[PDB]
Amino acid sequence: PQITLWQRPLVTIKIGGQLKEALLDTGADNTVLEEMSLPGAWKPKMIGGIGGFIKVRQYDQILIEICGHKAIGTVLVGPTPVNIIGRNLLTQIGCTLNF
């Protein structure tokens, strides 16, 4: 899939048995998900936006299906208004920018 940028680049994801919609976000170093139930141990973490900072729960080695592509990585969960797939996961699904 090629994707133009006239609308937000939103994709379907499956994480922890759940279907979510998420933003492909070349500006995000990290993947950040809205409040959800993920199984397993987590670490405290703080990440910075535009913005200020939010407190998130850090989860390592999480399987996530992004637009029908499987990828494993660190997922962060916390009070983000929008699900963000950052570059740690974008590189796993072979995502490039072209201009």
Place this chain on the structure above:
Amino acid sequence: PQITLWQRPLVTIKIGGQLKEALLDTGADNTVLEEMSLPGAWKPKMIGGIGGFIKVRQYDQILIEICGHKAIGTVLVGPTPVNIIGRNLLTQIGCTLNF
């Protein structure tokens, strides 16, 4: 140019006679620039990211030279830690996501 996402997708911009580095940011609807001197009138604006909101100055129909591609559009100036080229300007340089 094609650009992988193993590093931050940073490009050179010329805006208001000045050279800057900026992040190609598919997760940003707007272009946001660190405090700088831009000539002419502006409007007050508030923009939300992760962490909260920042007060910005809104400038319309600004000429921006992104990686040797000329584009005109709305640029926002305010206390962002990184220069962001959002989708309003990404569509002007024929920027697509490929995976």
